[PDB]
Motif scaffolding. Structure first.
Motif, PDB file in Angstrom:
ATOM      1  N   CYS A  45      25.264 -17.545   5.071  1.00 10.93           N
ATOM      2  CA  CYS A  45      24.499 -17.331   6.288  1.00 10.93           C
ATOM      3  C   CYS A  45      23.026 -17.624   6.064  1.00 10.93           C
ATOM      4  CB  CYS A  45      24.688 -15.899   6.789  1.00 10.93           C
ATOM      5  SG  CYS A  45      26.311 -15.610   7.522  1.00 10.93           S
ATOM      6  N   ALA A  46      22.360 -18.066   7.126  1.00 13.68           N
ATOM      7  CA  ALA A  46      20.924 -18.290   7.101  1.00 13.68           C
ATOM      8  C   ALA A  46      20.278 -17.534   8.254  1.00 13.68           C
ATOM      9  CB  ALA A  46      20.602 -19.776   7.188  1.00 13.68           C
ATOM     10  N   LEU A  47      19.122 -16.936   7.986  1.00 14.58           N
ATOM     11  CA  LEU A  47      18.373 -16.225   9.011  1.00 14.58           C
ATOM     12  C   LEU A  47      16.965 -16.778   9.047  1.00 14.58           C
ATOM     13  CD1 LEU A  47      18.408 -13.774  11.091  1.00 14.58           C
ATOM     14  CD2 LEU A  47      17.529 -12.382   9.180  1.00 14.58           C
ATOM     15  N   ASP A  48      16.501 -17.159  10.231  1.00 13.79           N
ATOM     16  CA  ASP A  48      15.122 -17.631  10.359  1.00 13.79           C
ATOM     17  C   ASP A  48      14.257 -16.450  10.774  1.00 13.79           C
ATOM     18  OD1 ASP A  48      15.581 -20.478   9.809  1.00 13.79           O
ATOM     19  OD2 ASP A  48      16.610 -20.510  11.745  1.00 13.79           O
ATOM     20  N   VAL A  49      13.132 -16.256  10.083  1.00 16.41           N
ATOM     21  CA  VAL A  49      12.333 -15.049  10.250  1.00 16.41           C
ATOM     22  C   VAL A  49      10.878 -15.453  10.307  1.00 16.41           C
ATOM     23  CG1 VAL A  49      11.790 -12.752   9.343  1.00 16.41           C
ATOM     24  CG2 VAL A  49      14.007 -13.781   8.826  1.00 16.41           C
ATOM     25  N   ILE A  50      10.075 -14.725  11.078  1.00 12.42           N
ATOM     26  CA  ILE A  50       8.625 -14.784  10.909  1.00 12.42           C
ATOM     27  C   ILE A  50       8.132 -13.404  10.512  1.00 12.42           C
ATOM     28  CG2 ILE A  50       6.426 -14.876  12.140  1.00 12.42           C
ATOM     29  CD1 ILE A  50       7.578 -17.375  13.618  1.00 12.42           C
ATOM     30  N   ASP A  51       7.406 -13.329   9.388  1.00 12.69           N
ATOM     31  CA  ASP A  51       6.752 -12.099   8.986  1.00 12.69           C
ATOM     32  C   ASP A  51       5.277 -12.128   9.347  1.00 12.69           C
ATOM     33  OD1 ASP A  51       9.069 -11.018   7.909  1.00 12.69           O
ATOM     34  OD2 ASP A  51       8.258 -11.002   5.851  1.00 12.69           O
ATOM     35  N   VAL A  52       4.798 -11.044   9.949  1.00 18.25           N
ATOM     36  CA  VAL A  52       3.372 -10.834  10.192  1.00 18.25           C
ATOM     37  C   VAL A  52       2.905  -9.695   9.281  1.00 18.25           C
ATOM     38  CG1 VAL A  52       1.606 -10.248  11.872  1.00 18.25           C
ATOM     39  CG2 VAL A  52       3.597 -11.618  12.572  1.00 18.25           C
ATOM     40  N   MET A  53       1.860  -9.936   8.498  1.00 15.57           N
ATOM     41  CA  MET A  53       1.370  -8.938   7.551  1.00 15.57           C
ATOM     42  C   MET A  53      -0.115  -8.657   7.744  1.00 15.57           C
ATOM     43  SD  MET A  53       3.337  -9.969   4.080  1.00 15.57           S
ATOM     44  CE  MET A  53       5.065  -9.535   3.917  1.00 15.57           C
ATOM     45  N   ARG A  54      -0.487  -7.394   7.565  1.00 13.23           N
ATOM     46  CA  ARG A  54      -1.889  -7.014   7.454  1.00 13.23           C
ATOM     47  C   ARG A  54      -2.099  -6.482   6.048  1.00 13.23           C
ATOM     48  NH1 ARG A  54      -6.417  -5.231  10.356  1.00 13.23           N
ATOM     49  NH2 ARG A  54      -5.391  -5.787  12.336  1.00 13.23           N
ATOM     50  N   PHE A  55      -3.165  -6.939   5.392  1.00 16.29           N
ATOM     51  CA  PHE A  55      -3.487  -6.517   4.028  1.00 16.29           C
ATOM     52  C   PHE A  55      -4.666  -5.547   4.050  1.00 16.29           C
ATOM     53  CE2 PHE A  55      -0.784  -9.140   1.309  1.00 16.29           C
ATOM     54  CZ  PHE A  55      -0.359 -10.137   2.180  1.00 16.29           C
ATOM     55  N   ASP A  56      -4.754  -4.683   3.041  1.00 15.49           N
ATOM     56  CA  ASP A  56      -5.888  -3.767   2.943  1.00 15.49           C
ATOM     57  C   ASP A  56      -6.935  -4.341   2.010  1.00 15.49           C
ATOM     58  OD1 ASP A  56      -5.013  -3.291   0.297  1.00 15.49           O
ATOM     59  OD2 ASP A  56      -4.173  -1.331   0.772  1.00 15.49           O
ATOM     60  N   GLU A  57      -7.976  -3.559   1.739  1.00 13.89           N
ATOM     61  CA  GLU A  57      -9.102  -4.046   0.953  1.00 13.89           C
ATOM     62  C   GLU A  57      -8.816  -4.027  -0.548  1.00 13.89           C
ATOM     63  OE1 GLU A  57     -12.875  -2.428   2.429  1.00 13.89           O
ATOM     64  OE2 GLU A  57     -12.413  -3.721   4.149  1.00 13.89           O
ATOM     65  N   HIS A  58      -7.546  -3.849  -0.903  1.00 12.74           N
ATOM     66  CA  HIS A  58      -7.101  -3.960  -2.286  1.00 12.74           C
ATOM     67  C   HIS A  58      -6.111  -5.106  -2.448  1.00 12.74           C
ATOM     68  CE1 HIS A  58      -8.319   0.440  -2.412  1.00 12.74           C
ATOM     69  NE2 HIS A  58      -9.003  -0.094  -3.407  1.00 12.74           N
ATOM     70  N   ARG A  95      -3.287  -5.225  -0.889  1.00  8.79           N
ATOM     71  CA  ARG A  95      -1.957  -4.642  -0.761  1.00  8.79           C
ATOM     72  C   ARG A  95      -1.456  -4.789   0.679  1.00  8.79           C
ATOM     73  NH1 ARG A  95      -0.385  -1.161  -5.330  1.00  8.79           N
ATOM     74  NH2 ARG A  95      -2.059  -1.439  -6.875  1.00  8.79           N
ATOM     75  N   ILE A  96      -0.141  -4.883   0.859  1.00  9.12           N
ATOM     76  CA  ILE A  96       0.404  -4.984   2.212  1.00  9.12           C
ATOM     77  C   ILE A  96       0.326  -3.643   2.928  1.00  9.12           C
ATOM     78  CG2 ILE A  96       2.353  -5.619   3.657  1.00  9.12           C
ATOM     79  CD1 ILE A  96       3.456  -7.157   1.187  1.00  9.12           C
ATOM     80  N   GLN A  97      -0.434  -3.598   4.014  1.00  9.43           N
ATOM     81  CA  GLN A  97      -0.593  -2.374   4.791  1.00  9.43           C
ATOM     82  C   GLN A  97       0.456  -2.237   5.898  1.00  9.43           C
ATOM     83  OE1 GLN A  97      -2.378   0.610   4.421  1.00  9.43           O
ATOM     84  NE2 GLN A  97      -4.295   0.132   5.489  1.00  9.43           N
ATOM     85  N   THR A  98       0.703  -3.319   6.628  1.00 11.88           N
ATOM     86  CA  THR A  98       1.758  -3.313   7.633  1.00 11.88           C
ATOM     87  C   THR A  98       2.501  -4.633   7.577  1.00 11.88           C
ATOM     88  OG1 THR A  98       0.548  -4.273   9.536  1.00 11.88           O
ATOM     89  CG2 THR A  98       0.286  -1.893   9.154  1.00 11.88           C
ATOM     90  N   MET A  99       3.781  -4.591   7.914  1.00 15.57           N
ATOM     91  CA  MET A  99       4.552  -5.810   8.033  1.00 15.57           C
ATOM     92  C   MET A  99       5.454  -5.698   9.252  1.00 15.57           C
ATOM     93  SD  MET A  99       7.828  -7.044   7.465  1.00 15.57           S
ATOM     94  CE  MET A  99       8.698  -6.518   5.998  1.00 15.57           C
ATOM     95  N   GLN A 100       5.473  -6.756  10.054  1.00 23.65           N
ATOM     96  CA  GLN A 100       6.424  -6.865  11.151  1.00 23.65           C
ATOM     97  C   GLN A 100       7.282  -8.104  10.963  1.00 23.65           C
ATOM     98  OE1 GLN A 100       2.789  -6.924  12.441  1.00 23.65           O
ATOM     99  NE2 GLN A 100       2.948  -4.860  11.568  1.00 23.65           N
ATOM    100  N   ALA A 101       8.604  -7.934  10.949  1.00 26.09           N
ATOM    101  CA  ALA A 101       9.492  -9.072  10.769  1.00 26.09           C
ATOM    102  C   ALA A 101      10.193  -9.399  12.077  1.00 26.09           C
ATOM    103  CB  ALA A 101      10.517  -8.800   9.684  1.00 26.09           C
ATOM    104  N   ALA A 150       0.843  -1.191   0.000  1.00 32.06           N
ATOM    105  CA  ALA A 150       0.000   0.000   0.000  1.00 32.06           C
ATOM    106  C   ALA A 150       0.882   1.246   0.000  1.00 32.06           C
ATOM    107  CB  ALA A 150      -0.925   0.002   1.208  1.00 32.06           C
ATOM    108  N   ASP A 151       0.375   2.345  -0.547  1.00 36.58           N
ATOM    109  CA  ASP A 151       1.186   3.552  -0.695  1.00 36.58           C
ATOM    110  C   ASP A 151       1.567   4.165   0.653  1.00 36.58           C
ATOM    111  OD1 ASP A 151      -1.422   4.201  -0.141  1.00 36.58           O
ATOM    112  OD2 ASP A 151      -1.564   5.843  -1.594  1.00 36.58           O
TER     113      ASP A 151
END
Lengths: 126, 127
Positions: free
Chosen positions: A96-109, A111-117, A32-33
């Motif tokens: 190198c390897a990195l283990d990650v969890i991404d949490v995303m919230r999407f909007d009504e289009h 599109r990614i509105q927020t992301m927490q890694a 999202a913009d």
């Protein structure tokens, strides 16, 4: 529009596909913009498309990185989800390897509105 | 304990999975801040406070026929938060089920869970 749980699963999977390929333009277009990135979580957010683009440019410039899911995407019914994955990269000539969890919230289009890694040094392997 | 370091987050969140796995409701409730908030599954209305949280875990774990195990490492931050992937195994009607979940937790400056969000839906269930 606002992604179903099944659609969230596909979108977050697509995101990982794009990170793996290293297409910064395609990644930024998923956002999202007025989206915000917190990566790693605990650090000040970044806002806006160019700032996010610059972030991914620094991170994924230009090859150097592989990414794959390491479990299924967990999806909610409110357009959000969370996913486990591993990022591979050669740092100082050392793989190198990195283990990650991404949490995303999407909007009504869709599109990614927020992301927490979520990750820190404890998640880095040589 | 103060605000957990990243290593301490890893340990606390792994301990939580161990307690869910043995079904020790009182030990889980004790890990929570007294005024904590649970969103499980994320998207549903939050439940607040140890009494309500106790009731919630008791309804799911009182029997104890539940198993839970990490299916990847705990991801921890430097601000007392973390996220972890795990699988819960359960029997609905002699029908064994498995549910894949990711929990996100924020700990307070006493090392207790202040908030948790559990990400999952039926697309993560296998009967």
């Amino acid at each position: 529009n606002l992604p179903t749980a099944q659609e969230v699963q596909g979108l977050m999977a697509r995101y990982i596909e794009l990170v793996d390929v290293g297409d910064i333009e395609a990644i930024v277009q998923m956002y999202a913009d007025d989206a915000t990135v917190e990566n790693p979580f605990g650090q000040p957010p970044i806002h806006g498309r160019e700032q996010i683009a610059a972030f991914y440019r620094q991170g994924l410039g230009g090859g150097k990185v592989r990414a794959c899911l390491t479990g299924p995407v967990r999806a909610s019914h409110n357009g959000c989800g969370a996913m486990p994955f591993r990022v591979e990269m050669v740092w100082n000539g050392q793989p190198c390897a990195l283990d990650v969890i991404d949490v995303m919230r999407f909007d009504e289009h869709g599109r990614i509105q927020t992301m927490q890694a979520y990750w820190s040094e404890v998640n880095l392997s040589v």
